[PDB]
Amino acid sequence: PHLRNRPGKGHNYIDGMTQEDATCKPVTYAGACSSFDVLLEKGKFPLFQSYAHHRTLLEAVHDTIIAKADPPSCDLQSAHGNPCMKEKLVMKTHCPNDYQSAHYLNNDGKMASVKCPPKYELTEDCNFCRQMTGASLKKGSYPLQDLFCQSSEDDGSKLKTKMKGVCEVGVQALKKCDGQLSTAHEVVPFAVFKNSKKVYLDKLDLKTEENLLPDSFVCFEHKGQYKGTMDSGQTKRELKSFDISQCPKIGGHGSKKCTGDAAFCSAYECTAQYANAYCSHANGSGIVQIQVSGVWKKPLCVGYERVVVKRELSAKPIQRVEPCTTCITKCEPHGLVVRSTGFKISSAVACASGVCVTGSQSPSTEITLKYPGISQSSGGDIGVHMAHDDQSVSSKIVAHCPPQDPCLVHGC
Amino acid sequence: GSLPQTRNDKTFAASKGNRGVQAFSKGSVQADLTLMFDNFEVDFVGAA
Amino acid sequence: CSELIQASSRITEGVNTKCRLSGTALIRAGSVGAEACLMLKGVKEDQTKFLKIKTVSSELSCREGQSYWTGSFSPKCLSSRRCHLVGECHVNRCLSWRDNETSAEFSFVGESTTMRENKCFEQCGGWGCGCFNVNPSCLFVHTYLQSVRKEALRVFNCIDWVHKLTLEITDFDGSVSTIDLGASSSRFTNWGSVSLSLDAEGISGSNSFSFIESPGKGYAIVDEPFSEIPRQGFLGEIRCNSESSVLSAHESCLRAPNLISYKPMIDQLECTTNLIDPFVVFERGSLPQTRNDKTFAASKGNRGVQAFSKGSVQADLTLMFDNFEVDFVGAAVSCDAAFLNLTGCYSCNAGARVCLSITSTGTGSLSAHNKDGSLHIVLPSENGTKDQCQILHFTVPEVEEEFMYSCDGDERPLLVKGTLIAIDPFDDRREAGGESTVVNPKSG
Ligand SMILES: *[C@@H]1O[C@H](CO)[C@@H](O[C@@H]2O[C@H](CO)[C@@H](O[C@@H]3O[C@H](CO)[C@@H](O)[C@H](O)[C@H]3NC(C)=O)[C@H](O)[C@H]2NC(C)=O)[C@H](O)[C@H]1NC(C)=O
Ligand SMILES: *[C@@H]1O[C@H](CO)[C@@H](O)[C@H](O)[C@H]1NC(C)=O
Ligand SMILES: *[C@@H]1O[C@H](CO)[C@@H](O)[C@H](O)[C@H]1NC(C)=O
DSSP states (O other), rough: GGGGSSSOOOOOTTTTTSSSSTTSSOSSSSSSOOHHGGGSSSTTHHHHHHHHTTTTHHHHHHHTSOOBBTTOOOOOOTTSSSSSTSTTTTTOOOOOBBBBBEEEEESSSSEEEEEOOTTTTOTTTOOOOEEOTOOBSSSSOOEEEEEEEOOOBBOOOOOOOOOOOOOTTEEOOOOOOOOOOEEEEEEEEEEOBBTTTTOSSSSSOOEEOOOOSSGGGEEEEEETTTTSSSOOSHHHHHHHEEOOOOBBBTTTTOSSEEEEHHHHHHHHHSSSSSOOEEEEEEESOSSSEEETTTTEEESEEEEEEEEEEOOOSSSSSSOOOOOOEEEEEOOOOOOOOESSSSOOEEEEEETTEEEEEEEEEEESHHHHEEOOOOHHHHEEEEEEEEEEEESSSOEEEEEEEEOOOOHHHHHO | OOOOOOOSSBOOOOOOTTHHHHOSSSEEEEEEEOOOOOOOSSSSSOOO | OOOOOOOOOOOSSSSOOOOOOOEEOOOOOOOTTTTTEEOOOTTTTTBOOOOOEEEEEEEEEEEEEEEEOOOEEEEEEEEEOOOOTTOOOOOHHTOOOOOOOOTTTTTTOOSOOOOOOEEEEEESTTTTTTTTOOEEEEEEEEEEEEEESOOOEEEEEEEEEEEEEEEEEBBTTBBBOEEEEEEEEEEOOSSEEEEEEOOOOOOOOOOOOEEETTTTOOOOOOOOOOOOOOOTTTTTTTTBBSSSHHTTTTTTTTEEEEOOOEOSSSSOOEEEEOOHHHHHHHHTTBBBOOOOSOOOHHHHHTSOOOOOOSSOOOOOOEEEEEEOOOOOSSSSEEEEEEEEEEEEBSSSOOOOOEEEEEESSSSSSOOEEEEESOOEEEBBBBBBBEEEEEOOOOOOSSSOOEEEEOOSSSEEEEEOOOOOOOOOOOOOSSSOOSSSOOOOOOOO
């Protein structure tokens, strides 16, 4: 259970719901916190479970990384007639049972939450409160979104949502569109940067770089350990959290003797005496950078959401209108000759009352063909189908000719 | 390669109504169609 | 040179009313180093926007198939000699020793990811040997390979070669656009997309050599067939799937049987092997090599290999939905031009070079057209005096013509002089041609 050694203070509790301060004030290996243990269930919250040593939303709030929204949580008991549940109603969530509250990261980049009236619980879609007699509600709040946070100083005041073909994602009106509007529920990754709002992304290209800052080290201690805190006989072998701020930095002063692994000894000063705590290096801690607009940036929080997106399928699939008549067709005793102005003609065919005649030649502005059947003698209308080199030119034309004299044709 | 193309004297092209392709090749056929039970008569045609 | 009358739009005074010109253009691509020209005609002494398609080069790029990695490896052996009936020194266990099973003596190695093997050799048994028992003793040997140099080489093969054209898109009001594309392929550039037909030849056969790449150092050619199964005494006897596996001698690497030579002489064991140094073979066959008139060489930007062979292709690239217009171009500009010289040949793929001295007061172009409209000359005009050059085609030993040159203003005459050299073909029947020809070797 190394994941219960939380970075920073590790305060996984929300204001008002302070009846679980025994185990939700700094989360340790011992107790159970309702607002944290849900994140560690298998199959749920996989993005956080991968980045399990980064702060949660509540932890980021308590470290002043993420602010709290105006009406931090407008209670449904006292503010059910106010336009509160607007960003929540556009998300498709799934709460378990016996939960009286649920927190999320609103559009402005702050933390808001929905709290049901006393003795009520949030339904399976977290949209309504229902009352069950003789039910024991949990003392925490359910994390609605799958996200992880961190401390960043990179500025993002110029960052904005840039999604192609999206009229509106979530509660953000990207642009104004008219006509067809494909509306659906989609999983959109999003990020929050310093001095910015929520930024939805089309792609999630993120990388992590390691460091030797205090948040990257997991420092623990044993219970019943000699010359340590809780130095009394134990009936069970359990661990205890340790504050790395006490172990001295290399070439510096400190208050406790402290030993660790290779990374800790490289960063901090490992003692040669009996140590008070063991400081290992975290699985994957570090700094996570997200690729936005082709440039890397340092986000405050990174997560994904299930929100209603309105797309535009198309304005026009394809337009195929070509009434082109840029050619001159004239019947000649030598042969049926058509000069195509501009576009060249390679092969062509001429039909006249069933019987057709073909012709092949190199691409040229004109082409001559033998007359089809007795159309030369009888005149009439003859259809021509030819293959042009260009496009947007009608391939079906009609030529009207009077009866011709074969004597000039065969004259010799 | 739009349809009006000739390959080794075949000249494939679009059939009338653009429901398929043709193949213009040298040749001929003998057709002997047969009618059967042909009955289409009325009474008003008796006048001259 | 080519109009857009069927899709032309009103490109009001001053402001621009372009209507997203959708009509495609079908024009023949120029030869290597030549340009393709477009005409966007609006109001006389105004507009006249020119879109140019420069043909940078035509290369016969490679389409790689299978590949692997290799490097330099050396073995290290640990030996432990035990008398009979000690540990697993039973003879039945001694001869039937599996190569992938580790002895108990070398347990400090434990679990490792390095390529390794284990052998057992019978030795003498007796008080002279060192053991009271007279049955043969055992010597257990554990050998692992380690990389000598911190570099790797990638060996691959070219199943086929593909024609590949590089174009420079001199767009309207700005020529910052260079693209590369193959046969029957389109690229979604600005103002729509550009497609290439290249209907002559989409391929140029295959080969039976192998190619080596050293990252950050270049390429090379080796004259052996690309074998997917390792072979002793050849290249790629020990092959991996990544540079890290090569540099770490990871166990996932494949190798041929019986590479390690064992010398179990009674004093100390000698573990050694003779391996083809891939770096030596790489240095032996650096790319600029000609084999049966092919002259493989490094592509520009060192992103692959080429194949210079005798041949030519016909390229007919197509534009579509080309729309790039602004409003500030409504103003007119004047310039001055002066003929400089004429060089080159006639009826040749190389063509004739015309250089012009343009003395202009600002940004602009040039639209000199001959009397019959057959030959067109386009050159940008800039502030002050500049010397630009252009490529055209001719069919006469001597050139003496007049062109109607006017840069969005008054029409003026420009007279061009000069002769052209004669290319000796050593064999001529009718003519040479003007198509797009790929680079060829001398021996071809
Ligand atoms: C031998 O007599 C035939 C019968 O008159 C002529 O063949 C056709 O005659 C039609 C009228 O009798 C013409 O119809 C006209 O066709 C044009 C387009 O072709 C239409 O615009 C007209 O509306 C239509 N009707 C009229 C009253 O004009 C046919 O065009 C015509 N077929 C042709 C000319 O090929 C023969 O012309 C005639 N031959 C000789 C040598 O005298
Ligand atoms: C003798 O000792 C070895 C230990 O080196 C042991 O493996 C072997 O089984 C023994 N042989 C006997 C007990 O016969
Ligand atoms: C590799 O070793 C394991 C255990 O030593 C054995 O089960 C397996 O058969 C070996 N593979 C071979 C002999 O190909």
